[PDB]
Subunit: 472 residues, 4 copies
């Protein structure tokens, strides 16, 4: 429903409380560090109004059209529709934008369908879902706790906790270490870390406008690099930004509270509501798109330099193909095996999604490595468009050709491969893939604990009956 | 349709021309090296008559019942039925029997449905399919060419070639290096290696009874070890055997010829007919069953020795779970994306099956390693059931307990884990998984060449338009 | 000093209390399961009297000649001499015999040189060293504790503990899970597992003749396979055997007690005495020899089948070469950086030896994999010498040739490659390399804790001074 | 001998013909993109005059003092001295400067000692060595050939070739794709790629001042990022730069020609002269220093966030320790096994150096990965020193602490870890380690071909005699 113009106007009128290198960012839509991603998100919103993609990206309901990521799926076909929307948006940025709002709309959609889970705060959840849906707003998630130097009563508000409760709502103080893509209208403070018994003061779930007084987003090093599409094909447009989120006695209205002082409710929220399943559904579609981009670049690089005649290179590209097919397989099974949860919400299969989200963090570094191995040293000496336009341009056109590519074309392609792997932007993507869904160690331990291993244990026990029978 | 008794009687009456350590095997049904696998195959046939599995393992047609692996699938549901049959049979032997006849029935079924591919030999193919189906016979595939010492006119019949053609059929001479599970009624001489231009004399496809004069199967080292289910839980029953296949001027009746002197027809047979797709479908179901067995053993081992409290061990088991889910995903997508080929035969998706068959050979050695890492040195000092039954039995019961298992139970379980990984039988399984479908290097190069990489290359080319536009 | 004949006579006269499949082994020198390794150890002893190797394998002292592994090294040259002896013995069996007595003589030699460490039991240690040296006896180490099923006062003697102390010595009861190469005159009960506070009853170190009443060695599955050098080139001669060691109220004379009820002394024994350093020195020489054998086989296999023309194969062999050089490097630095410990005993560098023993367990599975990848399916269908000698021999000679090898030669070579990797014997070698020195997880944690990381931390702290200076 | 001031004055007076983004660089000593590395190289030169390091970094000869990397070693002690100098210089920049001039001085030193190899150009080589030594100049190597688009007589001067020969010297035209650290007085055009028969026009070896008319160095993307030591601890000072090198009818005086039109001489130059051995000696010392830096950072990171209590983290740090010890071992053996080559030049052992240079390219990506795994998401949201100095500084000091570190200290450390791995500078280091010495595929094939595998093949042949004897 939202247009790119509406999104841009919203951030310009009520900008997120962003700070960059010790200074407040007055207008992120024009600031050199953020204007690129803002334009990109704006383009994602505009695509919703392109007739060619209207049916893929939006659905009609009572005379209004809403983004597909808000659709509460009733059938497997509806799930497929949500998946197609995730994929189309992902493809626009070669799967490089990892925290586009549809992944969180998936979470809020599930929370709302499973609103009974929240008890007294159920209506708050349903109303918030309707607000985000109707206004088609952008969201960001603030997660991870700070640490305290115990080498130095103690301050109980380092991590975000409730200072007090009033007739208007709750006052919170503390910080969240990470919020990716802060160019949003709203920030969600939902649990991503297990809470131990006694941590009620920190067991909260709520949402706030990003301009809320007392709320501050502190940026890390900008990885944009430049505006030239030739020199910085990806960083010039898909640099989402990561930030520290500070809560200085922030007032959270009661209407925006979803969970308050309940350890168990927080710990089981994502799984019980189905938010885990739906957000992971967006993720598998996203990573399929990302892998497709790497396959395309690898294939073009190999052909462009005539390296495709080498068995070694063909094998590496085939390896990327195997991984692409693995991700497509997880995506297909996630949808085909979907079943309704305790609240009647159809959710994609967790086994398939757990497989995808626990395997891709291992596959990605290898996919990145493969591109480095194909490009080799050719990725480390790429000139700028300015050099082609300068006095030595003629020399560059004569010396920077590929076995099957003209100079400008080869450099444009290798600059993209470089931006996908070795630029500050590209390297960040690696760290991001390794950890965005959580620490792999914890994720694997979680998978071990939740998985029903009984059918297999029983089959082996049955098979061993003949072994123990020798003693009869 | 066939019963275990009928299969046993068939091999006893007309045994395959098997040789073991320089001597002819008169009765494989009673010989210590082969009676185990014979009994196992017999049990697979008997299961077809168990009312609980009749509908899963067989289908009715004109008053007769045939094995499900012969069913020419018309719908995705039919494909699912074939898959369920592959899985049920596989589960009986923990996915350790890698060349049960249903994988080749899948090949012959596809050949028959796509019989037009064979031209003048089309009816031969259809009739052979009907013969195998009606009699429910067991088959084995003889593949791989011998080498010739060129450090020594030359003998043109080292690999299997046509010596002459007569009114009765063709006379062939040469050898195939491998035939796994030779306890079969028939041997298929189909192409698995690419033929170069000019190799018409070797471009053949035919089938023969395993007792055919001039045909000899020479066995390698027996890996059975013993008959005790406790000491040798798997090798005592699932040792399929591998053999060299010699053709000493063997007469092949014209009715058994499917391809004669046609290089192109041989090279495209498996892909064009859909045999590749259907055989790979049996394989993915089989490997899913195999992975489930490893998961069960790993889980029981960890719990039995209290190692499940270690994060490291939980992580390794979760890794097996990720691989199990990956294989289930490939299997699901293979069926859901199925489409009809040029001959109207519904075939499971090759992308998904290529992913599965090119990934599992890499996953298996790791799955095996994980079991070794969980069992550790505990896998290297396992006593025999005879020691428990001997004078020191009481000591063993007191000293060989697991943190949560009695001695006999722990040893029975570890003996199984050992037989699945470190016994001669278990180690062979590793080599087998690495190469049964082909040399990974060639397989990956084949995947690279057949895969349509254009959609991805086009997306990147489109994305790079903005890069090259800077020069406008 | 000892001859093979003396060793054989010793085991025949006073055989270790060995049990195989519920029965006592009366004469291991003639028993089919043990005669091979007995002959091999005998050959190692005989080599000491070959004039060509006398100076490498023995040293003279006061009119007597002793095995080099007993030499207390005073100079780096002496260390080199010990290394050359380790290497020569290792080479005789292609580095496949992993527990030849010289590795334990290294331990006892260090214990004796550092005898003061043992306090009141110091003379016992010195005298035992002299006994083993003078008689040139063979030893085996019994290690690892049993577990107790807590799913079932408790029996405090599952692991080996002291039941009582008398005027004659101590009475022990319990079991050790592993003893490799039990074809020895003596068994050492030394600590390999960390002891916790309060475990004094189990903190012991002593030695006993293997025929001691109450002592029982229970064998696991025999991996010999056969006596044919062609069919079983390694298992027929280097199958050391592993066994469970039972202590049924065994009396240990006071003269054979080295540590009694001292937790700290046990925990620091190997490191403080230098036994760790010297035993690891034997190990690095041993693994260098083992890697050389794999390199030789891989090279001959590649050349024999003409696979050496493939870049992929050359790369795999070069990988083995890199690992061989790494091990040679660790060995060289271990000797060149040697320094005296607290007791004045020259000990090889622990940093280099810790690197070698923590890296090889990871390199070995890959070296094994490489051989499997070069041999491929050719390793799974190897006939017996009996087939070459049988009626089909002529066919085998014509069909089993290598691109540059005659049939018998290729099969002999591949049978060796198979015995080094896929036979029960070969697969055991893999598990053995992964764990013989300890659980890698514990070994790496031990390395982390003992390593002086301060120099590096200090360099970084110094480098960061400029970073923090920006706030001045 | 040279001081930092002399080096700076030299580049300012006669600057290399550098181009950055289409413009000539007039003064690299003050240009924001190059002043950092210039200052760093200057500091390396100044260290030579610090009394504490004078004996390590320089040697006296006839009243003059020269850089240690010019010393022609006569004894193993001399080799050790060269190694200590390589190490001290490397440590100043945490092993991040990969092309400091001493690695090329090692090449020129070897060329000079083995000058007879060059025939008629021998005196040219000796004189050039003396020139570089006496003036203590900095050098850079221009390598790798361009490609030609054959999808488009042909221009025979794409790669560097001789256009004509005159009484003054030779005129060359073409390009070299890479030259790292162009902030040098001289550029060496030596062979790094195998030349095929008939490529005489391209088989050349010569040296030129970097300001030579017709010579142009074209820079790739600057990776400096910023001058703040806090925000960019490494990129602000060790960004060496990589560039394309253009030769536009450049005149090379005869005195600067070392090899002219000789394919074989070029192909065997590095190996025959010993340049390969000596340059690889600098490399192993360099990588040992680099690994020590990673160990220090990893250790400080783990302790700083209290992650050192996790077994997983301890294991990863121990892994870095194993790799550090491996590199130290290769370095030690390279020196201890040194022998004189055909020209009487003592050269470090190639086996050890081939092991080091072929293993480190595989170890480095893992070492980098380990740092990413320890720092995790904490590496992706690091604020700037400007944020600590800004209005929100107090909040940052309260929320960015480590379990055992104050905020500024933790961020300074993590910023360093980030700059070593994920910044554009850090990621480039990864690609650089993977390929600076050559394509691993070619390097491994070269190792396979040059290594004497006969001793191992012979040992196996001898061992197999017993196998073939069964047929006697
Ligand atoms: Na730029
Ligand atoms: Na047995
Ligand atoms: Na045998
Ligand atoms: Na900056």
């Amino acid at each position: 429903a939202r247009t790119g113009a509406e999104y841009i106007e919203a951030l310009k009128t009520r900008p997120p409380n962003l700070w960059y290198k010790g200074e407040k960012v007055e207008d992120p839509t024009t600031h050199p560090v953020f204007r690129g991603i803002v334009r990109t998100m704006a383009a994602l919103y505009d695509l919703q109004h392109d007739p060619r993609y209207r049916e893929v990206l939006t659905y009609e309901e009572e005379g209004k059209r809403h983004g597909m990521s808000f659709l509460i799926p009733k059938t497997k076909e509806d799930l497929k529709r949500r998946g197609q929307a995730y994929k189309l948006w992902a493809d626009q940025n070669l799967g490089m934008m990892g925290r586009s709002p549809d992944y969180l709309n998936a979470v809020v959609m599930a929370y709302a369908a499973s609103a009974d889970y929240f008890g007294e705060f159920a209506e708050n959840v349903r109303n918030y879902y309707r607000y985000l849906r109707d206004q088609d707003l952008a969201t960001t998630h603030a997660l991870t706790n700070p640490q305290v130097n115990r080498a130095r009563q103690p301050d109980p508000y380092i991590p975000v906790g409730v200072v007090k409760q009033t007739e208007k709502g709750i006052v919170v103080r503390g910080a969240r270490m990470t919020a990716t893509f802060p160019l949003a209208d709203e920030v969600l403070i939902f649990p991503s870390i297990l809470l131990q018994a006694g941590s009620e003061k920190y067991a909260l779930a709520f949402a706030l406008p990003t301009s809320t007084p007392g709320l501050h987003f502190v940026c890390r090093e900008a990885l944009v690099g430049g505006d030239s599409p030739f020199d910085h094909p990806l960083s010039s447009r898909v640099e989402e930004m990561d930030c520290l989120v500070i809560f200085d006695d922030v007032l959270v209205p009661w209407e925006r509270v979803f969970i308050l002082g309940n350890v168990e409710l927080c710990n089981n929220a994502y799984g019980a509501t189905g938010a885990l399943n739906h957000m992971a559904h967006q993720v598998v579609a996203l990573k399929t798109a990302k892998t497709e981009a790497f396959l395309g670049v690898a294939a073009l690089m190999a052909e462009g330099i005539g390296a495709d005649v080498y068995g070694h290179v063909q094998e590496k590209i085939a390896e990327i193909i195997v991984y692409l097919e693995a991700m497509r397989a997880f995506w297909t099974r996630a949808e085909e095996e979907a079943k309704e949860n305790a609240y009647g919400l159809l959710v994609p299969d967790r086994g398939a999604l757990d497989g995808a989200r626990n395997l891709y963090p291992r596959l990605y570094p290898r996919i990145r490595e493969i591109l480095e191995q194909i490009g080799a040293s050719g990725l480390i000496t790429l000139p700028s468009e300015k050099d082609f336009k300068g006095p030595l341009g003629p020399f560059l056109e004569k010396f920077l050709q590929g076995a099957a590519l003209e100079a400008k074309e080869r450099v444009a392609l290798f600059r993209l491969a470089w931006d996908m792997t070795l630029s500050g932007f590209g390297a960040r993507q690696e760290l991001y893939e390794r950890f965005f869904f959580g620490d792999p160690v914890r994720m694997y331990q979680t998978l071990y604990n939740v998985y029903n291993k009984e059918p297999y244990k029983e089959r082996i026990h049955a098979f061993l009956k003949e072994s123990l029978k020798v003693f009869e």
